[PDB]
């Protein structure tokens, strides 16, 4: 029940992070080679290409209310560029180890970064990028951080320690810790966006995707079928589907009501690493990225 | 080490 069309594919070096601009028809990509790119996926014309560092850049988001992109790299630094002027406007060492994930608060001037240093950190760009809090307690690399879109005073961290921790700004330890049973770790965590379900979702190298009710703390469903590490899984914001991507080279679209697979796509770009949703979706791979239209 | 780097 889903007409998947190809919008824009671009060959490049390995794409580790990806994000959609909320009002311009752009995607940001952050590459293994240290370059970051902004592309207009409608005109298929590059808007910016910047060599940021010599190391991988794994995390990248738009902060469109400031005309920014924010990126985090394996050289331990967070950098911000104004995409209208092209200029770097902030640059600081954020962690003493790799940055895996950056999340931006939807209404407040807060950024979270998750790191191989076992922490999440909260930065305030209206307080000279002050470190406002460090969230400690995970036992392995923090792979993914996400605000709860229904209450962004809380957020989740997914970690190779096999847990998700849900935290509140200004509170010392987690609201709660979810033990996932994904014994090879958690690579990704995402929240269901709409009010009807208090659900979250996790992806693992153990080849499973798990859906969680964060109120009951129970596992609602397990989605299996990928044949290698599952890099991500997310709920689509407007369609009743889940989209996952794997080192098996496939994207899978799952029915979010039935928890069964609907489509498996091999877009021919080798391993999948990252995802964004705008009914556009975009994913980064070993050999470039693709933007797809669903409806 | 591959998990950290890839």
UniProtKB/Swiss-Prot annotation, chain A:
GO molecular function terms attached to this record: structural molecule activity; ubiquitin binding
Protein name per Swiss-Prot or TrEMBL: Coatomer subunit beta'
Subunit relationships: Oligomeric complex that consists of at least the alpha, beta, beta', gamma, delta, epsilon and zeta subunits. Interacts with the ESCRT-0 subunit VPS27.
WD repeat locations: 10-40, 52-82, 94-124, 137-168, 181-213, 225-255
Protein origin, superkingdom: Eukaryota
Keywords recorded for this protein, A-Z: Cytoplasm, Cytoplasmic vesicle, ER-Golgi transport, Golgi apparatus, Membrane, Phosphoprotein, Protein transport, Repeat, Transport, WD repeat
A cellular component annotation (GO) from this entry: Golgi membrane
Recorded family membership: Belongs to the WD repeat COPB2 family.
UniProt keyword annotation of Membrane present: yes
Extra facts: Present with 129000 molecules/cell in log phase SD medium.
Localisation: Cytoplasm; Golgi apparatus membrane; Cytoplasmic vesicle, COPI-coated vesicle membrane
From Swiss-Prot, chain B:
Modification note: N-linked glycosylated containing high mannose.
Localization terms from the record: Endoplasmic reticulum membrane; Golgi apparatus, cis-Golgi network membrane; Endoplasmic reticulum-Golgi intermediate compartment membrane; Golgi apparatus, trans-Golgi network membrane
Motif COPI vesicle coat-binding, chain ranges: 1-6
UniProt family annotation: Belongs to the EMP24/GP25L family.
Function in brief: Appears to be involved in vesicular protein trafficking, mainly in the early secretory pathway. In COPI vesicle-mediated retrograde transport involved in the coatomer recruitment to membranes of the early secretory pathway. Increases coatomer-dependent activity of ARFGAP2. Thought to play a crucial role in the specific retention of p24 complexes in cis-Golgi membranes; specifically contributes to the coupled localization of TMED2 and TMED10 in the cis-Golgi network.
Subunit-structure text: Monomer and homodimer in endoplasmic reticulum. Predominantly monomeric and to lesser extent homodimeric in endoplasmic reticulum-Golgi intermediate compartment and cis-Golgi network. Probably oligomerizes with other members of the EMP24/GP25L family such as TMED2, TMED7 and TMED10. Interacts with TMED5. Interacts (via C-terminus) with COPG1; the interaction involves dimeric TMED9. Interacts with PTPN2 and SPAST. Interacts with STX17; the interaction is direct.
Name the record gives this protein: Transmembrane emp24 domain-containing protein 9
Source organism of this protein record: Bos taurus (Bovine)
Lineage: Eukaryota, Metazoa, Chordata, Craniata, Vertebrata
Portion held of the full protein: 230 to 235 of 235
């Amino acid at each position: 029940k889903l007409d998947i069309k190809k919008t824009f594919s671009n060959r490049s070096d390995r794409v580790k992070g990806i994000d959609f601009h909320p009002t311009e028809p752009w995607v940001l990509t952050t590459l293994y080679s240290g370059r970051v790119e902004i592309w207009n996926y409608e005109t298929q014309v590059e808007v910016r290409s910047i060599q940021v560092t010599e190391t991988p850049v794994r995390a990248g988001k738009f902060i469109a209310r400031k005309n920014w992109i924010i990126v985090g790299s394996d050289d331990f630094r967070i950098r911000v560029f104004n995409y209208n002027t092209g200029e770097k406007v902030v640059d600081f060492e954020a962690h003493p180890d790799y940055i895996r994930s950056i999340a931006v608060h939807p209404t407040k001037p807060y950024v979270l970064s998750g790191s191989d240093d076992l922490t999440v950190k909260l930065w305030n760009w209206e307080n000279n990028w002050a470190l406002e809090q460090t969230f400690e307690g995970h036992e392995h690399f923090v792979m993914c951080v996400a605000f709860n879109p229904k209450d962004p005073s809380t957020f989740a961290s997914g970690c190779l320690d096999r847990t998700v921790k849900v935290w509140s700004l200004g509170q010392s330890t987690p609201n709660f810790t979810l033990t996932t049973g994904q014994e090879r770790g958690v690579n990704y965590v995402d929240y269901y966006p709409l009010p009807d379900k208090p659900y979250m979702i996790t992806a693992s190298d153990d080849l499973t995707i798990k859906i969680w009710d964060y109120q009951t703390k129970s596992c609602v469903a397990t989605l299996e079928g990928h044949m290698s590490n599952v890099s991500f899984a997310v709920f689509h914001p407007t369609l009743p589907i889940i989209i996952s991507g794997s080192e098996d080279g496939t994207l899978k679209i799952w029915n979010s009501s039935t928890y069964k697979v609907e489509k498996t796509l091999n877009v021919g770009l080798e391993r999948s690493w990252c995802i964004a949703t705008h009914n556009y979706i975009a994913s980064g791979f070993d050999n470039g990225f693709t933007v797809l239209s669903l409806g | 080490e591959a998990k950290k780097l890839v």
